[PDB]
Design a protein around this ligand. Structure first.
Ligand SMILES: O=c1cc(Cn2cnc3ccccc32)nc2ccccn12
Ligand SMILES: O=c1cc(Cn2cnc3ccccc32)nc2ccccn12
Ligand SMILES: O=P(O)(O)OC[C@H]1O[C@](O)(COP(=O)(O)O)[C@@H](O)[C@@H]1O
Ligand SMILES: O=P(O)(O)OC[C@H]1O[C@](O)(COP(=O)(O)O)[C@@H](O)[C@@H]1O
Ligand SMILES: O=P(O)(O)OC[C@H]1O[C@](O)(COP(=O)(O)O)[C@@H](O)[C@@H]1O
Lengths: 510, 519, 518
């Protein structure tokens, strides 16, 4: 009772559950929320990447907004070098995924003449004549988006340089709402506009093909506005990249409004709060965040909460109180993963930022009101004929009933473990696979602790099944998830191959 | 249904309620969560203060860790000048409370090279000597660090961790002494003048109410402050000590206990029972206990305060980046919204308003987020849990209060108008957390100021003289609240409001609830 | 410790049941309306006086038998007995009068010219049904006449015909022009003028017959409070009853009796058209399989509670009490479960109309209802009623829920409501408070009709209108404090909820006061 917030777990109301949250109730070792770190000058080396892994990084994120293919290939090579330095012990080997975050379509201003000053309620004309592209000034500004006039109307706002400058409407004349240092080749945002820019730009096609060649596990597809955008990303990945997960980045009003069709078309979602906070009033981000996490939990699809989670840690070795809170509340909301950008890419304390996310995520997971969450997940999920779905909900129920140390799932593609994860058990889900890509991808789903079996396939299938379950038991005992004599849930299928999980057993730890 | 997250309000589950939160669903005009602003050099002028009031500032906080009595007396004077500049129209006047935040049992360093602005870059693994010899109190550098805690050597042992400046710098006690400590820099950084020192493992024996606190509390009574935010409250006896120090002259001053250490969290229940309200003082609390556990202590304290109907304040680094930037980080927007969703009565600004470059933008942002987050609350579960967890009582006032809240949800009322002398009647309504704002009409200026501590209370100060016929005096205050609500856009003619009154004059007779249309 | 308050606290319905305590005694107040059928056993002014002391609230008159002259004398006896208590207005109890229509009944003739003669019908035997009026007073074990002329047209070979509360069942073997050769499936004693059911048949009889029209017009003339309309199959049948009552009987409550398949299938349209429902289990249990009646009952009680319209549970609730002074366990359970289901009223037919223990049956209904009312899981019920209730702009609906909420919070002795038309008290009753609703009115029809709503205890104020309106309000509130104190619903110092309006007349209820009992 005095550990894992188990007194708070027993509350009959959410109010009382909150009243019982105890700073003296220590959490277990298992940390269920996946940690995604953006790699950069502060974290690119092998030595550092080894420490990143030890501190808790599960996914290495490569930002293709900048850098060449050569640079990115070397980052990937470094990640795999640091990752396989741990391969010698398969019991302790932690798989590490590689994510490719696309540049995506963007609106950029021209070259000035370099800085200029804009003020109060002055005038500035927006032109598209590619003769003014080299002569940007205080009275006239050129843009690379030719359909800007079609998507904007009388009273529409234009945001310049990550929202620093505000403006009001073959050309458009604007009245400055908020001035400042007008730079050259700066990003432009169109709030409320149904931007008709390509789903995937020319550079993105090249990047996505590079990703297939580099054997990446997932793509974080930028500026996803509709279902067709996801379909274009999927078509570019083709047959060679059919198994690569697609996470759609919701960055503007359109993406939020057309969310249900994007979720159905995608493998998962990223709440890209940075871009979203420029596109929608910042006081509304928390709404879009809580709506997307809720709907992803409802569909059983992975959701990533991103941007400025521990921002002050770029310069400081400890985060602010708002940051500590933001990480906890993203876990409490129901986010599968939490992300680090500048904090691991450019900052002075990358390792400390990763360690803090791990500590907060672990305390937040014990703090979840599983009693309400599990009843609501059950009530909202459809009654289907699927044997694996019934098995998965059965296992979660059994794990709550006997307070099991884990739910051991045998999986080839990962699907069987994903089905367990959508019911959010408190027990860690040990997914035993032989597929190295599945083990990497499994980090996207809350609760899943992926373990790669390297043992050779036995000829008697029932013995091969037993070998993989025993492996999971060994990983559990070694990492102190449970010990000999404890009860665990074990999920297996009625024959080899995917799609047959239908067997739930309550097994003592040997 | 398309406004105030009413589609989300209708959800049968919390998960579905979250699924329905809509960025395109605009909130009402009224903002329920009170905004406390620390007043410092960036916000002291009458000019700025008038604009703070307009931006949404409800309480002016005075941090007695710094500044002389003369400085604070002038800040208070300027707060009153800005507030009274709006008194010509009683319909548009907004009361503004004055809060005195004590220094308390603080441990502080001296001056780096005799300058209150100079800094030293401390290196990891480096040796630093801590002295109590006042010869170095202005001669601090990268080798010698003076602090004002005379009994440091007794309560600290070898291996003990010493945190400096919001715990950003860390040190380990390597060799103990009589008035000195030989330390090893565990975590480096830039060390400035007069920084905060924490000793999480140590049994700090500093008095509850210091000699400086007694002088400041006295000045608070003389200055007619509305509340005291008492630093480092550890047990109920500490609250009792503040209460006894304020004595008879300060008996109506509200005491808010600041929980910022492990003992305070541990002995929370007895502290709460003794206090008029609580501050979740996350700054120190996040140094004293592991920073990852702060959200647990925060939600336990908000829940327990909500369960007890006593005000709770969420404080520190809520919009921190805004000291230097005109826009907050996404983590900051989140924190503000989540403090409101948790059930915090008030939210607070420190350096963001006291010394930052954008104090009005920080006030405006807290106002914008709070109002958005108030509509996002799951009132269906919150009101059911508040009802079930509250005892059955013979108190007529409590029954009227819950009946009034029930009526306000049924007709989606524009407000709950409450006539109150002490504030109690409006406090009893706030406890049940209605969606509609509570317009508290009072003739007592202190009540009007102190009501800002409670979620939803929109206090109004009636200046109209007392009429011969009591029933006409009652109707005059109700009409005054009708006038305020219309003028501020909380409602318009024909809308329905709830009205709370008593059956005779004086406090304690609230027993009448009326459902009336707006004239 | 009292009125199942320990079970009231339960966080789950399962634990609510676990905590039900036979040693937790109920309050004095009984909220469920008791409807009694008047007959030879209960017609005397002297018996009617005792029926009123036992707890009868509504006197039901079955217009399937008797003449207008006979029914007018019944109504006179009910009024004489009710008005005997008017000497003390504190103890006076309003009593309503309900007219129950004959509707499209199908009845057999006389057994060998006698009203009491019986024949033994044996299983396997042939029975000939005739429409020939030469046999209307010559029924026996071989021939049986019935008054439904178009019986042959609506039935077929193989069809089943039920006689006498469905105790005798016949199977049609041969169909004819004005006859039916049948076989005895369920035998027994066949008596005179027994009711007939044709479960599968499309009975074409009118919803409102000429006799029904006369009875309905007589209802208006006799100033009845409500009508119980038999065999209502659709909305158009209720509109037919409504039309007949017309402007003169516009304020007479229509309670549609659901006693057939079509009535259940069309229930929503029926309920929208009506002022209330009777779950008419007798004929319903013959018209549809008997094992489905509880389903229909719970569906109808639920939908009426959801619509805020009165619902009556009727027929064979304490049947064995016709011949015995105590009921069976099933009968005790049935009365308890109708109250638990949410029925506003419970009814007695044979038990009060012709049985040997009428006063006993009324007393028993009173004792069970009171026990069952304390057993209600108010915590879930109030939460569900609020959730399923729409958000209104109506100040009166907001004041009513506020008052119910306030009554739960302080566990008040009562919710005192001042009402002209009764609407304000009905709005309080739709939220099911635990506290009894003392509805103070000066309108006598309002006071009588208030018995149709769970929890309403109507009191008729005799006192003339005081000059100052506030004083007239206070006089009526004090009258309720006096009724509640005399009936032992509360004592001095207890807390009660008071509901009034801001000006005289109907529709201004907007004031809720929490006041100590003087
Ligand atoms: O009733 C509540 C209230 C809250 C606080 N909260 C956190 N995001 C919120 C979004 C909207 C409303 C309240 C919100 N969280 C939970 C969690 C589980 C069950 C019930 N909950
Ligand atoms: O809230 C209720 C009320 C009732 C009716 N009922 C039947 N025995 C009862 C005993 C006491 C109170 C109500 C009772 N049944 C259920 C069934 C499932 C869930 C909730 N229920
Ligand atoms: O989650 P997935 O990809 O459907 O895989 C689960 C599969 O794994 C198994 O447990 C074992 O299959 P293999 O022996 O082919 O690995 C199957 O019985 C089951 O259908
Ligand atoms: O909240 P409090 O301090 O009890 O004050 C509420 C009081 O205000 C009133 O409505 C009006 O009283 P006054 O006329 O004395 O101000 C009382 O009837 C009621 O008891
Ligand atoms: O229930 P109804 O028919 O709306 O009547 C309730 C009415 O009774 C009153 O309390 C008293 O009215 P009277 O003084 O006219 O009898 C009104 O203020 C209120 O509107």
């Amino acid at each position: 009772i005095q550990t894992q917030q188990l007194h708070a777990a027993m509350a009959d109301t959410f109010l009382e559950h909150m009243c019982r949250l105890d700073i003296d109730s220590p959490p277990i070792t298992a940390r269920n929320t996946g940690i995604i770190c953006t790699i950069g000058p502060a974290s690119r080396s092998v030595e550092t990447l080894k420490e990143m892994i030890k501190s808790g990084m599960n996914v290495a994120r490569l930002n293709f907004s900048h850098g060449t293919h050569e640079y990115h290939a070397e980052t990937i090579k470094n990640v795999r070098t640091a990752t396989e330095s741990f391969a010698s012990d398969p019991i302790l080997y932690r798989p590490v995924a590689v994510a490719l975050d696309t540049k995506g379509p963007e609106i950029r201003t021209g070259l000035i003449k370099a800085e200029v000053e804009l003020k109060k309620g002055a005038t500035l004309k927006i032109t598209l004549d590619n003769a003014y592209m080299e002569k940007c000034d205080e009275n006239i500004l050129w843009l690379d988006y030719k359909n800007i006039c079609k998507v904007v109307e009388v009273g529409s706002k234009i945001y310049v340089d990550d929202g620093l400058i505000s403006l009001q409407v073959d050309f458009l004349v604007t009245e400055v709402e908020n001035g400042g240092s007008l730079g050259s080749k700066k990003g432009v945002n169109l709030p409320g506009a149904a931007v008709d820019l390509p789903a995937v730009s020319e550079k993105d096609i090249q990047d996505l093909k590079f990703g297939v060649e580099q054997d990446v596990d997932m793509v974080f597809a930028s500026f996803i506005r509709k279902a067709s955008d996801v379909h274009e990303v999927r078509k570019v990945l083709g047959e060679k990249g059919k198994n690569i997960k697609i996470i759609s980045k919701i960055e503007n009003h359109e993406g939020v409004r057309r969310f249900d069709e994007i979720l159905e078309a995608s493998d998962g979602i990223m709440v890209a709060r940075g871009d979203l906070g420029i596109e929608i009033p910042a006081e509304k981000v928390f709404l879009a965040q809580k709506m997307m996490i809720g709907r992803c939990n409802r569909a059983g699809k992975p959701v990533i909460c991103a941007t400025q989670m521990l921002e002050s840690m770029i310069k400081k070795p400890r985060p602010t109180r708002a940051e500590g809170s933001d990480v906890a509340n993203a876990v409490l909301d129901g986010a599968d993963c939490i992300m680090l950008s500048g904090e691991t890419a450019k900052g002075d304390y990358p390792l400390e930022a990763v360690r803090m996310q791990h500590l907060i995520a672990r305390e937040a997971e014990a703090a979840i009101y599983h009693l309400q969450l599990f009843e609501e997940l059950r009530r909202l999920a459809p009654i289907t004929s699927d044997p694996t779905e019934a098995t998965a909900v059965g296992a979660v129920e059994a794990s709550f009933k006997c307070c099991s140390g884990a739910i051991i799932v045998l999986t080839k593609s990962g699907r069987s473990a994903h089905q367990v994860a959508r019911y959010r058990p408190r027990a860690p889900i040990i997914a035993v696979t032989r597929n190295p890509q599945t083990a990497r991808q499994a980090h996207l789903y809350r609760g899943i602790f992926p373990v790669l079996c390297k043992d050779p396939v036995q000829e008697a299938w029932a013995e091969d099944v037993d070998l993989r379950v025993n492996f999971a038991m060994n990983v559990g005992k070694a990492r102190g998830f449970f010990k000999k004599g404890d009860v665990v849930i074990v999920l297996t299928g009625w024959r080899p191959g995917s799609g047959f999980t239908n067997t739930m057993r309550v097994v003592p730890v040997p």
